[PDB]
Structure formats: structure tokens, C-alpha cells
Design a protein around this ligand. Sequence first.
Ligand code: A1I7Y
Ligand code: A1I7Y
Ligand code: A1I7Y
Ligand code: A1I7Y
Lengths: 124, 126, 125, 126
Amino acid sequence: GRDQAGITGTWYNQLGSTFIVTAGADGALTGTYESAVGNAESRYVLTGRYDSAPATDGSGTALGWTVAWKNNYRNAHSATTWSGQYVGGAEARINTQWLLTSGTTEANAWWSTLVGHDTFTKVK
Amino acid sequence: MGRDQAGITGTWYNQLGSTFIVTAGADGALTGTYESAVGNAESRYVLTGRYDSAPATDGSGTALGWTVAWKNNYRNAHSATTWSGQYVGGAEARINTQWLLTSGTTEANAWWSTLVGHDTFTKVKP
Amino acid sequence: GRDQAGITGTWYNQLGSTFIVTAGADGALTGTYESAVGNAESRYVLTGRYDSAPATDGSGTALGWTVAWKNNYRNAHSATTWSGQYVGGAEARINTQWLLTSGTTEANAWWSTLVGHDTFTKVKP
Amino acid sequence: GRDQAGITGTWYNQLGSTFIVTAGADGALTGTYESAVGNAESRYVLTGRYDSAPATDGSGTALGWTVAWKNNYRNAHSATTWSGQYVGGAEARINTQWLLTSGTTEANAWWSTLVGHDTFTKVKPS
Ligand SMILES: O=C(CCCC[C@@H]1SC[C@@H]2NC(=O)N[C@@H]21)Nc1cccc(S)c1
Ligand SMILES: O=C(CCCC[C@@H]1SC[C@@H]2NC(=O)N[C@@H]21)Nc1cccc(S)c1
Ligand SMILES: O=C(CCCC[C@@H]1SC[C@@H]2NC(=O)N[C@@H]21)Nc1cccc(S)c1
Ligand SMILES: O=C(CCCC[C@@H]1SC[C@@H]2NC(=O)N[C@@H]21)Nc1cccc(S)c1
């Protein structure tokens, strides 16, 4: 993939969260996520997909990934999905939006899902 | 094994007739394929995701999510959909999701890059 | 306003909430919302906008409204916006997605905002 | 306490859209929005609500407003609702998440809604 080199590596969000990922040539994202916020301790497995043949009009590369917030330290009974685009060049960034869904009883389902945005850069 | 690995592993159908075949792994992995029924999509695309392999036993649903990049060997729509939701098991087993579809865009068009919606998957055709 | 009549009146969500609205010829939505879930006691003011000259190809009518969850009896320090479209006809619906934002500290901002959907109908489910 | 004066005024988002708004004592927001992107020309009416009695623990003031993209110059068959919170003081700002829905056929309904986020400050941007 074209941005397999630019994607693979270590990324930091605005809050201090760290994302390490390897971009496969087929389009896989594999890695670990470590949150600066929430009911999270240490690293959690991340799996994802990216467009491995983007357009060539200076358009970004579409990707997305999931982290379920269970590891050998803790279980928040929740999962976050990040949807977004990788932009490369001088100040590469992954700009995302996300949905964090918690497992709830039916009664509480209406309030199961938070939404937000995250920008990741190669430096922080 | 995961508590809902057997419940989750299988074929799922949403309200639009899109179909998703997933294997739940013991660790929390979800792997499989998605066939969309709407938009710039043709045949099967790879899906990868994660689920809570040890959910609450208070009768809460099981948190999960998965991602489809809309490239396969026949088409590329330059976009990706992430589904975030939860699995409820039983006779009327379902997966309730909210989703995000991001297209690759220029910076001028970034502001309108991401669609939002909701899908409900059941084990039967709608 | 084309769907001014079809929009005006009482609507119900699948969760037993009710919304009463008057659609003005100007594209105003005015009315009140009465909850069935959340820190929500009784009636709350609603204000919003609708497209008063829709397309004529069988497309819906875009609209949105806000409720700040403060009335004379309770205050949840939060607000919901509903963005959606009105579809009229035999089985008239208003299909929405919404954002519920709570007032927070900067520390807790990242989890200020919940997201969901609701479908409103003219008949009480 | 009441941020009527704080909220009331001229705001600009990161893309140079302008938002003139008057907060009322009853929790009303009224004014105009002029966009810098999309099918928009000049000013559109906005109406909304804010919490007229917010917490006193450093919390922001929850708010929300709507613009239907119809005026005497253009009709884009859509509406945007912003949901967010006002924070006063230095770097007084309104942080929002937004949903933009267009009227569609039932066939195109799955992709009727865009999502994003906007931050408004009183300083017009670059
Ligand atoms: O605690 C967790 C699980 C880990 C949170 C990580 C999130 S994912 C989006 C954002 N971006 C980051 O980097 N970190 C945060 N969830 C949860 C559920 C319900 C209420 C609350 S307060 C917290
Ligand atoms: O065409 C595609 C890619 C495949 C769409 C499948 C979606 S994913 C969420 C939802 N759930 C399903 O089962 N199907 C739909 N994207 C795209 C981008 C920009 C404008 C438009 S119209 C379409
Ligand atoms: O729940 C409320 C106030 C009542 C709204 C309930 C929602 S608004 C969208 C949807 N449509 C309905 O009719 N009901 C639901 N506030 C609140 C604030 C902070 C945290 C939490 S959990 C709850
Ligand atoms: O073009 C418009 C009307 C103006 C949208 C401006 C947006 S509202 C959220 C964000 N915040 C701003 O300040 N600007 C942007 N609607 C429309 C309809 C159908 C398809 C598409 S792509 C766009």
C-alpha cells in the first residue's frame, strides 16, 4: 500500500494517548493502543483496515480501527471505533471521529454510545 | 473461550439486507467478511474487529466493533466504515450498532468526509 | 410552508416520549418535549428549524431542534439536538439522529457527548 | 451563573463561518449563521437553547442550535444541529459536535447524515 510506510509507526493524540500500528500491504492495521483517559490501563490490542490504493489527487487515505477495552489488567466492557483519514507530508496526521459503546442493559441502551474526535500526529 | 464467541460467530443481516460473516476468536478478535447492499460496494470485503470476551453477567450486552475498508479485488470506494455497538444474545439475538463512514478527501472537503448512522443486525433475513 | 401541516402536531418515539410542535411558515419549529428516559421530569421547551420548501421528488424534509434539559422543576445541565427528516404520507415519520451534550469540566469533555437515533410517529406505539 | 452576556455575540469557527447569536434569559438562542463551505450563500436563521442556570463547579454550559439551509438565496434541503458547551473566561470558546441531515429518498436515507465538530471563538481565524 502507498501509505503503508507513512501509517506504520507511533502516533499521539491531543490528550497524550499513544497508538502503535503496523499497516499491512493488504490493508490490515495491527497494533496496540494506550489511553491517557478513562477506564484504561496500559496497552490494548487494536485491529483495523486502511485503503491500500488511495486516490492520487492529494485525497487522504480512509481507515478505521477498533479497540475493545479489555486487557490483562482491566475490562471496561466497552469498545471504541475510530473512523477517519490519514493525511501525509510534512505534518502527517490521522484525523478521526470515534464512537465508544459500552455494554448496557436494554433500559440503558439509549445512553450506550459516546461520540468524539481525535487528531493523531507523529510527534508529541 | 469468550462468553459470546459461539453466539457471535456466524452470519448477520441488517435492515438493508447487507450481510456480515464473522468469526469471534477466544482472545477478543473478530474476523470475517462483509457484503454491502448499498453504495459503492460489490461482493465481499474484509472485516476485522474486537469484542469483549468477558462481558458483565448482569444481563448487559457485549461491547464490540469492527472496520471495513471498502477496497477488494473488484472495487475501491476510497472509504471505510467503523461499526460500534453491542451484542445481545437469546432467541431474538441482535447486534445494535452506530456507524461512521469516512471517505478519503482533500482538506477542502474534509468537513464533509464522515457519514453517521445505525444498523441492527439479526440472524434472520429482515 | 409545504409540510407545515404534516409536521405540526404531536409525535411519539418508540420509548414513550412525546413531542408537540408547531411548524411556522417561516421554517420555525416551536413546541415542547416530554421525556420518558433520562434526568427528565415533565415538559421542556423545544425550538428548531425545518426546510419549508422541500424538493418534489419524494425526498424528505430536513429539520432539527434543540431541547435544553432545564425547566421549572429540574436541571440536568445538558442539551439534546435532533437532526433529521420528516417523511409524510400514510406512515408519516420523523427519523432523527441526536447528540446529547452535558456541561463538563475540560478534564471530562472527551466524554461530554452521547449519540443515538429516534423515530417519531403520529400514533402512540 | 448565566452566561447570557458571554454567549451573546459574534463567533467564528475554524473554517471562518460566522455565528451571530443572542442568548435570552429564558434559555433562548436566536441569530444568524453564515457558512464558509457547502451549498450556502449569506445568512440563515438559527434558533436554539442553552442552560440558563449552569453548574458552579467549573463545568461548561450545555447548548445547541439548528440551521435549516434555506434562505432567499439558496435551499440545500438540509439542516445542521450543533450540540456542545460554552466555556467562558480566557480562551472563551464554544465546542460543538454537529449533525447535518439532508432530505433524501428512503433509498438514499442511510447516507442522509454527516457528522463533525466545530470550535467557535470570538477571534476571526487566519
Ligand atoms: O473508560 C472507558 C474505556 C477507555 C476510554 C478511552 C476513550 S476512546 C475515545 C477517547 N480517545 C482516547 O484516546 N481515549 C478515550 N470507557 C468509558 C465508557 C463510558 C464512560 C466513560 S467515562 C468511559
Ligand atoms: O459506497 C460506499 C462504501 C460502501 C457503503 C456501505 C455502507 S457502510 C454503512 C452502512 N451499512 C451498510 O450495511 N451499508 C452502508 N461509501 C460511500 C461513501 C460516500 C458516499 C456514499 S453514497 C457511499
Ligand atoms: O437524559 C437526559 C435528559 C433527557 C433526554 C434523554 C434522551 S435525549 C435523546 C433521546 N430522546 C428521548 O426522548 N430520550 C433520549 N439527560 C442526561 C444528561 C447527562 C447524562 C445522561 S445519562 C442524561
Ligand atoms: O451545503 C450545505 C449547507 C451548509 C453546510 C455547512 C456545514 S454545517 C456543519 C459545518 N460547520 C460549518 O460552519 N460549516 C459546515 N449542506 C449540504 C447538503 C447536502 C450535502 C452536503 S455535502 C452539504
